[PDB]
């Protein structure tokens, strides 16, 4: 068992939010035994010393693209609409893995330098979809992200994607990234098969991500609908970007929610990425269905979209998590950081209701209660008993933030660094004094920096 | 002499926007020498290994109020909008100050702490706005930030402000803030005489710095102006904020800009802050008048404000700088992290023009020689023989920034921390491996957090 011992401040958004100042948290193997003060250092075989330190659930990233990582400030797609975006990313994708420098040997290396940045920001989950599956013949790319994710100790979703719409007809995406649904959904069930670990604490799970609306036939919507039920995984895709509903009327005369919610997709086994442009009358019906929503502030900003209606979302009782998207539109994978970027580029909106600005704590669960419900994951975002130790602890005695009276808000609103001080997953410590534990930082730099394209 | 060699980017900021890779700085006192590859080590006596590292100039903060430093993440002032934040805020500070925990000796230390956050976030000048003189003298205030800034050895201008408008006659402030036009006049002048070096490179500057338009006397803003001209130093003061114009329109029946035309603040010797929404007829006025504006993206997100017309006064060749504010309104020091903040935010303003968005070489620019400019120095905030050793490196080979294509860029749109890792002001090393080398951290950390409120 692992102690750790006086924690300045704790979080645990519990369902009455409590919080505990000077407390402990104590863990017996993947699990949270207890949270509270002056506990037992009994059967603990090692104390950690949490003074000055603020605790967490562990963050959780509800949407990533990895890939992506090896795509940062690149100075032509700096300042980009979508469409130049989309373009831009896909060509060079292409373009590198047709000359051989996009294997999935290279993807492996930049899944495992994005994963590592994200246990040093405090992230103990990922979800990614991986888009980039060259060939009709999707190569061992999923393999790799979750060969990354396990030799790092970090939970990981991986929420197979395609683009089963090819603009060979009526679609929008380019034939080389098109399956027919069948072997889309056969190589699913194939990794479910090899990956998929259901039991409480699993530390990697599978869910079907279909690109979106605009990308995908109805049949693979529906043939994963099914799926879903069959294997009790998850349902994720892009929603309501700006364009999509002129997309999906075109094609289908219907709104995307529409769409969704004909192809069997309006359920609660849904989490939903963006949610930027809704219609408002749709969004009780969102409600009703009880989807989840992934706020991924940075992207919508870097795309010039503006602000989804979270407030909107959580007034009507919708489950709202957190995500960066991938490193080719934030460009960081710092989850943290965006969360001081969602406090206040809200605030604009509502220029004379700071009642419907979102708080930290609003924020803060977002990253970690909510992105656990988006991925339907009731054992996580949560400190307390029975829960997996998932843990992330952050230094509140640092110059730069001195003067801070409320650490949770400190947390969002102030530091020249969101490097997370002692990280736990699954009860293990992966990064203690902001240092990895087992990882060889220095060694997967120098590697991955060579795979760079 | 000081040689820092191998940097694997420079970024001069000088009239050709030159930049250069693998390259060398050569420091001579307070001087660059030069700037190049390969430069001789002739007579150096210390080599500082460069590689892995950008250098620009020093950061340079136009815009912050130290003392605020004592008021972050405060609960009660986390959404507020203006009215309710500057009641908080003056309510808070006499009431400390009644209660002998808000005197000079306590901002020396506040300021301290910020300061030291400044330099270690790669900012080697600060522009302190300092307006809390309670009391029937003007307190030792100022001289405390001086000593503070002196102490750590950063470079530092003293805009010595005041609210010399009482709410009896139109002022949005009670009367224990305000003093007699006559008694700031006086103090400022001593302020001038004392602390003043106005030779190239020189440490300490003073400014002279009304609160605003709605906040002082016409009396002291004409003053000001005379004694600009016989002492030749600067002029500061807030600028269209939201309300200002109403506030502006009552008491004088004229826009906050022709007020400050009238009473002599519509020149080359001013730099305002904000500026957030004035009437767009009145820009091209502020280019011909050669005022310039600091740029506060993070205060303005805060409160509801939203976006200044930043690329309007690019394009009309205004002077542009940027700042943080205080941290009661942030609530950091981290100038560096701010431009994120503004790299994302300004672009939904103009969805499908992305040329409009502000970049982050701009916005870099802004950080440096536009503050520089802001503060009417010609020897600060560009990488060039002749100017200030003031310059401030990070390293480009962490985790976290992998992947990166142009570290410009990444500098900006990547990275868990925005920690510099060599800081040199004046010719002095004062942070190498993310450290001070003169400061003792612990030591400032535990002395300030004794004396926070
Ligand atoms: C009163 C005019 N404006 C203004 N003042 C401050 N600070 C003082 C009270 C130290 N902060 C801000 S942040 C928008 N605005
Ligand atoms: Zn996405
Ligand atoms: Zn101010």
């Not at 919507?221 to 892009?238: C, G, I, N, S």
């Not at 009507?316 to 969602?342: E, K, P, Q, W």
């Not at 829960?387 to 230094?395: E, F, Q, S, T, V």
Request: net charge negative.
């Amino acid at each position: 068992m692992i102690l750790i011992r006086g924690l300045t401040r704790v979080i645990t958004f519990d369902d009455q939010e409590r919080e505990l100042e000077d407390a402990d948290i104590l863990i017996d193997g993947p699990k949270i035994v207890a949270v509270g003060k002056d506990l037992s250092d009994r059967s603990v075989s090692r104390t950690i010393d949490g003074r000055g330190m603020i605790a967490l659930p562990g963050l959780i990233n509800s949407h990533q693209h990895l890939y992506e990582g090896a795509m940062r400030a690149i100075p032509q797609l700096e300042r980009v609409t979508m469409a130049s975006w989309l373009e831009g990313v896909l060509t060079r994708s292409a373009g590198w893995w047709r000359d051989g420098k996009f294997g999935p040997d290279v993807i492996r290396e930049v899944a495992r330098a994005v994963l590592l940045e994200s246990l040093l920001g405090g992230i103990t989950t990922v979800a990614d979809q991986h888009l980039f599956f060259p060939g009709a013949t999707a190569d061992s790319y999923i393999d790799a992200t979750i060969e990354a994710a396990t030799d790092l100790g970090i939970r990981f979703h991986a929420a197979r994607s395609s683009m089963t719409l090819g603009k060979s007809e009526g679609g929008f995406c380019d034939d080389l990234f098109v399956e027919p649904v069948d072997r889309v959904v056969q190589h699913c069930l194939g990794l479910i098969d090899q990956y998929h670990e259901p039991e409480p604490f699993g530390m990697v799970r599978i869910a079907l991500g279909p690109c979106g609306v605009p990308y995908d036939k109805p049949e693979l919507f529906e043939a994963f609908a099914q799926m879903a039920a069959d294997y009790d995984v998850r349902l994720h895709t892009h929603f309501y970007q700006p364009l999509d509903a002129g997309m999906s009327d075109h094609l289908y005369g219907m709104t995307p929610w529409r769409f969704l919610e004909k192809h069997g997709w309006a359920s609660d086994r849904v989490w939903l990425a963006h949610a930027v442009v809704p219609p408002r009358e749709e969004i009780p019906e969102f409600a009703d269905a009880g989807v989840a929503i992934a706020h991924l502030i940075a992207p919508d900003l870097r795309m010039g979209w503006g602000l989804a209606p979270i407030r909107e979302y959580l007034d009507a009782g919708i489950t709202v998590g957190f995500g960066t998207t991938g490193s080719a539109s934030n460009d960081g994978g710092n989850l943290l950081g965006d969360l001081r970027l969602a406090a206040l580029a809200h605030r604009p909106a509502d220029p004379n209701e700071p009642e419907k600005w979102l708080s930290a704590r609003e924020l803060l669960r977002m990253a970690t209660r909510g992105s656990a419900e988006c991925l339907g994951r009731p054992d996580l975002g949560v400190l307390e008993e029975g829960r997996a130790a998932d843990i992330a602890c952050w230094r509140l005695d640092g110059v730069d933030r001195v003067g801070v009276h409320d650490p949770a808000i400190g947390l969002i609103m102030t530091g020249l660094s969101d490097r997370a001080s002692l990280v736990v997953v699954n009860g293990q410590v992966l990064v203690e004094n902001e240092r990895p534990v087992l990882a060889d930082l220095e060694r997967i730099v120098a590697n991955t920096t060579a795979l760079i394209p």
